[PDB]
Amino acid sequence: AQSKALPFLKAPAKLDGSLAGDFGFDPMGISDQVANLKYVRAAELKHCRVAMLGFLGWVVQQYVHLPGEIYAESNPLKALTSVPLLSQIQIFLFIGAIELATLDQTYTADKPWDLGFDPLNFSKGKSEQQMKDLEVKELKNGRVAMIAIMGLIAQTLYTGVPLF
């Protein structure tokens, strides 16, 4: 009834109105245990962004490579082992440096997903409806990418073909 995604079920109590992308999709009632939807939305958006970047990297590594030889592997899962540990540890340290401040931030803030990242100011001057539309676009694209990046990983692990 109240779920748009599952037009027959009634959504849970915490799925209503605000927090764009709310289509009443919580059949298992996971939202009933979390105190609020702030942390789960932060986790969902982090997954969405990481999955978008992962899909883009998957395709680009399929087609484009860095000039060096160590980056010449086309299969992303094989490149996970072919690439030297120095590059991967540098990436991990960069991510952890970004992650510790946001670790302090996420567990207490009202909008843990709002990291203040807008270098090009794509949101300055946008109205509330436009901002909500942008949030919906981001969430949609992220969910589709998550499904897609998991599918790419599965098909590479099951057939060895990294794409198509």
Partner 1 sequence: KSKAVPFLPRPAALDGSVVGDVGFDPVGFTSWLPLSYLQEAEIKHCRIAMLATLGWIVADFVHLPGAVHEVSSLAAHDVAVKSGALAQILIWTSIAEAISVIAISQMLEGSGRQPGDFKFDPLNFAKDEKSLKKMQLSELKNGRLAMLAFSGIVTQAALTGHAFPY
Ligand X SMILES: CC(/C=C/C=C(C)/C=C/[C@@]12O[C@]1(C)C[C@@H](O)CC2(C)C)=C\C=C\C=C(C)\C=C\C=C(C)\C=C\[C@@]12O[C@]1(C)C[C@@H](O)CC2(C)C
How big is the site for partner 1, counted in residues (CB under 8 A)?
Answer: 8
- Rounded to the nearest 10 degrees, what angle do helices 128-159 and 38-63 cross at? 60
Report how far residue 45's alpha carbon sits from residue 42's, in angstroms, rounded to the nearest whole number. Answer: 5
CB of 90 to ligand X, least distance (A): 20
Q: Which of residues 18-37 bind ligand X (CB under 6 A)?
A: none
Q: What angle do CA 55, 101, 60 make, to 5 degrees?
A: 15
Q: Which of residues 49-78 bind ligand X (CB under 6 A)?
A: 52, 55-56
Q: Is 38 in the site for ligand CLA (CB under 6 A)?
A: no
Q: Is 28 in the site for partner 1 (CB under 8 A)?
A: yes
Long-range contacts of 145-151 (CB under 8 A, 24+ apart): 145/48, 145/51, 145/52, 145/54, 145/55, 146/47, 146/48, 146/51, 148/51, 148/55, 149/51, 149/54, 149/55, 149/58
**Binding residues vs ligand X (CB under 6 A):** 52, 55-56, 117-120, 122, 141, 144-145, 148, 151-152, 155, 163-164
**Binding residues vs ligand CLA (CB under 6 A):** 5, 15, 19, 21-26, 30-31, 37, 39-44, 46-47, 50, 53-54, 56-57, 60-61, 64-66, 71, 73, 79-80, 83, 87, 91-92, 95-96, 99-100, 102-103, 106, 143, 146-148, 150-151, 154-155, 158-159, 161, 164
